[PDB]
């Protein structure tokens, strides 16, 4: 399965990702909420607060997997014993594994992220930043 993302750069850029490479990246990623050099992986809010309430005006991305569409439970540190939430990790057309402990310099994460679950690492989808490498995330197609 090939996912296509559109990202604007300093103009619209079309980027293709192999679903297999991305699933492999998330499996290799630690199950941690940002307690790494690069800050990745980290909680992907999808518009909710840590109690599972949808923030007003925000719209969640629908993935189509019950595991991914359930509201989260995220304690302050992402380690409460009842926690279950989404994680985001950088993914690339080449499939290389992002250096999550990289700090000065921090590896460029690019615009795309593989979204998966904590604690079971279920694959949700590939999303990408609209412009550059931060800001609004949009689900890529396939």
Question: Any chance you could write out the topology, listing elements then pairs?
Answer:
Blueprint: E1 2-8, E2 12-18, H1 19-28, E3 42-44, H2 66-69, E4 85-90, E5 112-118, E6 123-129, E7 137-139
Antiparallel strand pairs: 1-2, 3-4, 4-5, 5-6, 6-7
Subcellular location: Secreted
Organism: Aspergillus restrictus
Function: This purine-specific ribonuclease cleaves 28S RNA in eukaryotic ribosomes, inhibits protein synthesis, and shows antitumor activity.
Question: Quick summary of this structure?
Answer:
One of its GO terms (biological process) is negative regulation of translation. The chain is mainly beta and 142 residues long.
Written account of the structure:
The chain has 142 residues and is mainly β. It has a single domain (1-142), classed as Nuclear Transport Factor 2, Chain: A (Roll). It is 10% helix and 28% strand. It is built from 2 helices and 7 strands; from the N terminus they run ββαβαββββ. The protein has helices at 19-28, 66-69; strands spanning 2-8, 12-18, 42-44, 85-90, 112-118, 123-129, 137-139. The strands form 2 sheets. The chain has a 5-stranded antiparallel β-sheet with strand order 3-4-5-6-7, covered by helices on one side. Strand 1 (2-8) and strand 2 (12-18) form a beta hairpin. The termini are close together. The PDB classes it as ribotoxin.
Strand order of the largest sheet: 3-4-5-6-7
Question: Per the principal axes of the C-alpha atoms, what is the gross shape?
Answer: globular
Structural class: mainly beta
Number of helical regions: 2
CATH homologous superfamily annotation: Microbial ribonucleases
Helix percentage range: under 10%
The domain tally reads 1
PDB class: ribotoxin
Keywords: ribotoxin, ribosome-inactivating protein, protein-RNA specific interaction, laue diffraction, cell-entry activity
Assembly: monomeric
Entry title: crystal structure of a highly specific aspergillus ribotoxin, restrictocin
